């Protein structure tokens, strides 16, 4: 059971837990044996009093949110907002600090608007990708949504954390437009056009007038987000998902070189993802099926996985969108960029001899379909937890191969398999490292923790920095953005002390602490 | 001559001007008769005491900028940052509050980088569209810029003020990525990946890590931007500008209905502008050759203006960009959207009998070429001054024609010709009123001011709010954004006090005043 947070007497807490009970009822304030679904499901720390929520209030309306926050102020008790708390690999529901009261907003799951003609939604935090998909399919509206894989999570929560998907609307927060925010002092505000009485333009024009501030409430503890609009892609006129595989590990250098101009110009219309053999193999197989050793898979077994599954060492999944004459012209350009590489194979779905297969699973994500497979890369090594390192780099052959060499060496030295991805949004490259681990074994937890810290250090040194991370590592990732003795984070703390003078919102989110605890 | 700001002695002001000239050098502080170019070129006020800058100071570098800002805190003297200060329809280089010192960053004009492979540029505030386009050409870089019409101003200032242009990169601040900011306390920060030392990714990935704050320094007085990256469209494989004209003034309703889907699915790849006959005639004609009288042009004349200029009542020019196969597909989808309207005509550039012409002139702008010509809204009625009203609205026929009617009637009622434009970014329609008028005449200035206030009130009362405005009206536009007793401006005022406690940056900007002056 979790301790109190330093500064909060037992009376103050228990008073506040009763005053929270007034505001939302006594059935929607959770303690004790009801608390554990909001623990980190993939624990990394071997000290068991870190990332431990004291309680979990669960309001149903914006107004409750406001009082909660006013009470939180009154008793000096900190809160930790989560839209749905399916933030797996990042801590799930749990706070950075022990003792903070989770503020859960599953209950505020009203899809407030879905406009077909203008291509947007207005949703509250609780709305899941599944819920929003379904409501669209039931009404037969000709709109796609843009989805993580698997499609756990909140439309809102995923976006606020700068999350990403697999269609042209892949940059979730880029597609955001208008939000309502409960400030730390209890007051509510609407950004953009939503600050105009009588507007019909909240989800039509991001800026509004004057300082553009939506972004400060993303990867932030500056407020609580109670509604958010997002743009949604009109159902296109055509769709052709594809896979391009490469034989050799070294091919990732030339592949990244070829990908650059296609991505910088928008020729490839969604995110480009080039995945290593084991990360894609892990969509349909486990390690035990290919190798019995405790260590990482040997060359000879890779060759066997590649022949068996018609994957490469590298595996480029992508999709063409819009009308057929357009899709034909983009294909011509993309295909001719890769054709002259020894060993390259190209595949549309109908060229896939297997009926369970990478491309058929990926095609669902690249058309906005939230799919919940019980078979992914978590199962690879018998099951457990995952963590991901996804730093930014320039889209260059040299930057890719370097990251690959650095990470695969270290990852394999520590006994894990290399599960890597090269991902391009538009002008950004991300070498994403996935490490699966047994989160019940304390010695493996030690290995992972250490390996992680070394990867951050070595990548920072090469100018590569993380954009999204686990609650455990939030302070560490803040420390990488250290230009001029932490000038940026000094400003954030200025803003934090002004909006939240009593430090009751998500203390330590993104490394932002507030004067009382700093 | 101009007065001291209230709360600022001449002892203070005089010692602060010494230090300034100690920092930058005596030759780069301006007073007396050298303030004349920092005056609003297009005056609206009859009160000769308002929007009058006490002095200017022209730093050579970011660090001189910091030095000045520190001096400004310690003597309570306020600063009005301008990049090149060419903000002509919005009060130009002058400040809301008289006595404010102009901080003129035009000497800070380095092109720090232009990168071809990654399509981007890093620029100081003084860099003009013309300097950047010329740099690019000198070096033979296959990049386009995105430019206003005409293109006299600042890549940075325009972008910070939510400027727009005529390519797919038409939304300037959208395309921005990374910036260096001198805060109101004199500390300097870098945003995004720029906060990480050794990064090569400042201009490739907006977010960095944690709260997204670039927006807070646009249309704001929260800091002074000293560096900014912007993304730059790579050279397309083909480019075809077009013009479509509409016979009847009522055509705009159904036209706006047809633009919606084409714009939302991105079939029209740049901003969609639909201009009124009179707006173009008054660039490349005179009033007296069509109608002799003192008042606004009668319906009679319109049919004559139309045949003379080979235009319509509404005139839509856009451009297709891509390999010819893709442009063809788009043209077909766009021509077929409008083919069935009575009176529609279709023009490519070589179909234009006139070589001084809207399409030919716009073909330059929609491929990112900045131009000055011998033309503008003068030599129509001996005007000189102009001001714009550009609120946001849904893309509907009903909304378009409704604002057409609302505005024209009122503009004509006040003696001005109706000069209008319907523009669509992505999901956002603006009906834009250009109001041309005599700067010199105090009788037309008065009427302009009564007319402007009405337009604001009436558009606001239907839920259409402005996104960009003249220094004179900043408070009024701000007060339309009033949901929940001006909650949003109450938050901005909070932030202003934390960052700028002495209130020395640009008091009034976007109606943001801060504690001392409220
Ligand atoms: C196997 C696997 C695959 C994954 N694949 C992807 C993928 O493809 N793409 C991807 O983007 N992610 C991916 N993830 C990460 C994660 O599981 C998803 O992003 C998930 O959909 C997001 O969780 P959520 O929506 O519940 O967010 P939440 O946990 O509800 O919110 C995220 C965080 O943001 C803040 N926050 C959220 N809502 C609010 C609010 N209303 N007000 C204030 N602060 C708030 C909090 O600090 C919160 O902890 C993957 C994870 C795993 C384990
Ligand atoms: C005939 C005519 C046509 C026009 N056409 C267009 C058009 O097509 N598109 C368009 O967008 N505009 C247009 N404009 C408006 C205007 O001329 C342009 O926006 C111009 O490019 C802006 O001048 P600038 O870049 O020098 O801005 P500046 O005056 O330098 O900056 C504008 C404002 O931004 C802020 N600012 C500037 N620099 C900084 C900084 N470093 N830090 C903090 N705040 C800062 C200040 O508040 C300043 O008042 C037109 C105007 C006229 C008169």
């Amino acid at each position: 059971a979790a301790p109190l947070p330093e500064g909060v007497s037992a009376e103050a807490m228990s008073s506040a837990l009763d005053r929270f009970a007034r505001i939302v009822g006594a059935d929607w304030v959770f303690t004790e044996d009801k608390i554990t679904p909001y623990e980190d499901p993939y624990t990394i720390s071997n000290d068991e009093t870190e990332h431990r929520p004291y309680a979990a209030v669960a309001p149903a309306s914006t107004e409750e949110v406001q009082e909660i926050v006013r009470v939180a102020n009154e008793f000096g008790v900190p809160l930790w907002p989560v839209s749905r708390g399916k933030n797996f690999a990042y801590g799930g529901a749990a706070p950075v600090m022990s003792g903070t009261v989770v503020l859960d907003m599953n209950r505020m799951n009203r899809i407030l608007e879905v406009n077909e003609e203008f291509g947007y939604a207005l949703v509250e935090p609780g709305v899941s990708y599944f819920e929003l998909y379904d409501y669209i399919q039931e009404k037969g509206l000709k709109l796609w949504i843009d989805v993580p894989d698997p499609g756990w999570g909140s439309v809102v929560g995923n976006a606020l954390d700068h999350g990403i998907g697999y269609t042209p609307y892949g940059d979730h927060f880029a597609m955001q437009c208008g939000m309502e925010v409960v400030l730390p002092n209890g007051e509510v505000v609407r950004t953009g056009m939503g600050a105009m009485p009588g507007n019909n333009t909240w989800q039509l024009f991001k800026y509004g007038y004057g300082p553009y501030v939506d972004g400060i409430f993303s990867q932030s503890n500056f407020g609580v987000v109670t509604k958010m609009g997002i743009w949604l892609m009109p159902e296109p006129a055509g769709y052709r998902p594809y896979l391009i595989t490469f034989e050799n590990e070294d091919d990732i250098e030339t592949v990244t070189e070829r990908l650059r101009p296609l991505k910088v110009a928008g020729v490839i219309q969604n995110g480009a993802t080039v995945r290593s053999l084991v990360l894609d193999a892990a969509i349909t197989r486990t390690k035990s099926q290919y190798y019995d050793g405790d260590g990482p898979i040997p060359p000879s077994v890779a060759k066997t996985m590649m022949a068996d599954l018609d994957l490469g060492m590298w595996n480029f999944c992508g999709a063409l969108y819009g009308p057929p004459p357009v899709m034909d012209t983009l294909w011509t350009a993309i295909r001719d960029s890769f054709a002259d590489i020894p060993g390259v194979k190209f595949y549309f779905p109908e060229d896939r001899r297997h009926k369970v297969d990478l491309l058929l699973h990926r095609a669902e994500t690249m058309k906005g379909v939230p799919k919940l497979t019980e078979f992914n890369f978590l199962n690879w090594d018998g099951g457990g937890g995952h963590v991901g390192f996804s730093p930014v780099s320039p889209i260059t052959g040299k930057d890719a191969i370097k990251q690959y060499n650095m990470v695969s060496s270290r990852v394999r030295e520590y006994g894990f398999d290399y599960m890597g991805l090269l991902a391009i949004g538009w002008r950004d490259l991300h070498h994403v490292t996935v490490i699966v681990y047994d989160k019940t074994d304390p010695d493996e937890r030690k290995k992972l923790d250490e390996l992680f810290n070394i990867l951050v250090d070595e990548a920072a040194a090469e100018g590569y920095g993380e954009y999204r991370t686990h609650i455990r590592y939030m302070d560490r990732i803040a420390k990488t953005y250290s230009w001029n003795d932490n000038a940026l984070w000094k400003m954030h703390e200025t803003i934090k002390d002004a909006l939240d003078p009593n430090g009751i919102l998500a203390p330590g989110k993104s490394g932002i602490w507030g004067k009382n605890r700093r």
Side-chain angles (χ1 to χ4, degrees), chain A residues 1-32 35-518:
Chain A
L4 293 192
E6 172 181 58
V8 176
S9 36
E11 307 88 58
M13 166 59 76
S14 54
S15 310
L17 276 191
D18 184 51
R19 219 159 149 177
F20 298 160
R22 286 206 169 299
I23 285 161
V24 306
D27 295 329
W28 306 112
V29 167
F30 304 123
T31 56
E32 292 186 348
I35 206 87
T36 64
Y38 302 135
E39 307 278 0
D40 183 11
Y42 309 152
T43 300
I44 309 155
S45 197
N46 282 316
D47 171 357
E48 310 165 66
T49 58
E50 286 171 353
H51 320 326
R52 312 300 310 289
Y54 196 72
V57 65
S61 102
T62 296
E63 209 204 16
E64 283 163 15
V65 173
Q66 308 194 220
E67 285 280 37
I68 299 173
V69 170
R70 285 199 200 90
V71 167
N73 270 292
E74 199 169 352
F75 298 131
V77 169
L79 301 178
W80 181 279
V82 331
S83 291
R84 270 186 35 111
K86 315 297 136 169
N87 204 15
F88 304 145
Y90 296 109
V96 159
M97 199 190 229
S98 264
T100 92
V101 181
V102 174
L103 170 70
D104 191 3
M105 311 205 308
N106 264 294
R107 291 184 76 221
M108 304 171 59
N109 66 316
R110 224 200 313 154
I111 302 183
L112 303 160
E113 197 179 350
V114 182
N115 190 304
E116 186 187 23
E117 69 189 308
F118 294 137
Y120 75 72
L122 186 59
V123 285
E124 305 177 301
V127 178
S128 77
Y129 291 108
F130 287 98
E131 287 171 349
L132 179 63
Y133 187 66
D134 282 346
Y135 175 115
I136 285 152
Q137 296 311 304
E138 281 206 44
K139 301 295 189 200
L141 304 175
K142 286 285 197 294
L143 292 182
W144 288 2
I145 67 172
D146 184 288
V147 113
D149 188 8
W152 296 310
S154 161
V155 184
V156 184
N158 184 279
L160 290 194
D161 205 60
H162 300 161
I164 63 143
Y166 296 97
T167 94
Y169 286 44
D171 184 342
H172 291 171
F173 196 65
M175 298 311 82
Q176 174 271 337
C177 192
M179 59 167 70
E180 187 179 75
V181 176
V182 179
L183 301 186
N185 65 0
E187 291 298 278
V188 54
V189 300
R190 290 192 197 196
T191 66
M193 292 318 305
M196 259 254 293
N199 69 86
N200 290 252
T201 49
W202 206 9
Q203 282 60 74
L204 289 197
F205 173 76
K206 288 169 168 275
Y207 296 153
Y209 175 57
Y212 183 40
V213 294
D214 288 62
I216 88 173
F217 303 102
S218 70
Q219 291 193 353
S220 188
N221 51 357
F222 289 172
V224 192
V225 182
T226 58
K227 332 206 162 56
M228 183 177 95
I230 194 179
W231 301 337
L232 308 170
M233 185 171 130
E235 189 170 325
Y239 179 67
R240 293 207 278 122
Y242 60 83
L243 168 67
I244 305 190
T245 66
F246 310 89
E247 267 305 293
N248 305 290
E249 59 169 353
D250 277 359
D251 287 334
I252 192 51
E253 182 171 353
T254 190
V255 170
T256 298
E257 284 292 289
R258 296 148 184 269
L259 272 172
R260 166 168 71 242
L262 301 179
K263 276 303 301 160
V264 167
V267 176
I268 291 168
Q269 298 146 288
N270 61 338
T273 65
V274 185
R275 287 195 191 79
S276 53
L277 170 59
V278 168
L279 170 64
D280 276 339
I283 289 296
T284 68
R285 304 294 185 264
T286 78
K287 196 187 177 193
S288 344
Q289 305 176 347
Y290 277 102
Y291 181 62
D292 272 334
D294 320 286
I297 68 160
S300 58
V301 171
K303 253 161 182 157
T304 284
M305 287 171 81
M306 275 156 63
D308 281 12
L309 299 168
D310 294 350
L311 297 175
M313 285 300 301
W314 297 103
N315 294 295
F316 174 25
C317 272
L320 309 173
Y321 302 81
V326 177
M327 289 191 310
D328 296 351
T329 290
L330 303 193
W331 184 238
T332 291
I334 292 154
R335 198 196 194 287
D336 294 355
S337 298
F338 296 110
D340 80 347
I341 305 162
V344 67
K345 301 290 170 45
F346 306 85
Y347 297 97
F348 299 108
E350 64 266 356
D351 305 289
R352 294 306 282 164
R353 55 191 185 64
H354 307 247
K355 281 164 61 91
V356 189
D357 192 74
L358 172 77
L359 179 57
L360 303 194
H361 177 272
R362 288 288 190 238
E364 287 288 85
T365 35
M366 292 199 294
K367 101 167 86 188
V369 178
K371 274 308 185 195
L372 185 69
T373 60
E374 297 177 358
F375 194 115
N376 56 44
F377 55 78
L378 272 156
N379 296 305
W380 175 254
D381 208 317
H386 86 114
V387 78
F389 184 53
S390 57
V392 188
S393 45
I395 321 173
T396 278
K398 182 206 65 71
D399 279 298
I401 192 92
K402 185 204 296 173
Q403 273 166 289
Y404 162 70
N405 283 325
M406 294 172 80
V407 175
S408 69
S409 306
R410 286 223 173 253
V411 162
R412 285 165 69 75
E413 201 208 337
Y414 280 62
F416 302 111
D417 274 289
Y418 173 63
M419 306 183 134
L421 198 175
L422 286 119
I424 301 151
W426 191 357
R427 289 197 235 254
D428 48 318
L429 179 75
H430 294 72
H431 177 90
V432 181
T433 302
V434 174
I435 321 156
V436 179
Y437 59 106
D438 179 2
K439 49 90 207 176
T440 73
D441 180 351
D443 304 320
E444 289 276 280
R445 297 210 294 259
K446 180 91 205 63
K447 289 170 71 182
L448 179 78
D449 193 26
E450 166 181 314
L451 160 61
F452 185 85
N453 275 288
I454 295 187
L455 287 181
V456 182
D457 292 344
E458 288 187 354
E462 297 289 343
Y464 314 142
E466 180 58 280
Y467 78 99
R468 209 191 169 187
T469 194
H470 183 301
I471 55 177
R472 162 165 202 63
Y473 295 129
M474 273 181 197
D475 269 74
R476 178 62 197 88
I477 301 306
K479 277 167 53 89
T480 59
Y481 287 97
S482 72
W483 191 81
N484 190 27
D485 191 23
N486 299 101
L488 189 55
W489 255 248
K490 278 157 188 193
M491 180 196 74
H492 290 318
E493 298 268 13
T494 288
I495 284 160
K496 174 78 182 164
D497 291 350
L499 287 183
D500 185 359
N502 292 316
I504 54 80
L505 272 206
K509 179 68 192 86
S510 302
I512 301 158
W513 279 100
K515 202 196 193 181
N516 289 333
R517 307 179 148 109
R518 164 194 86 226

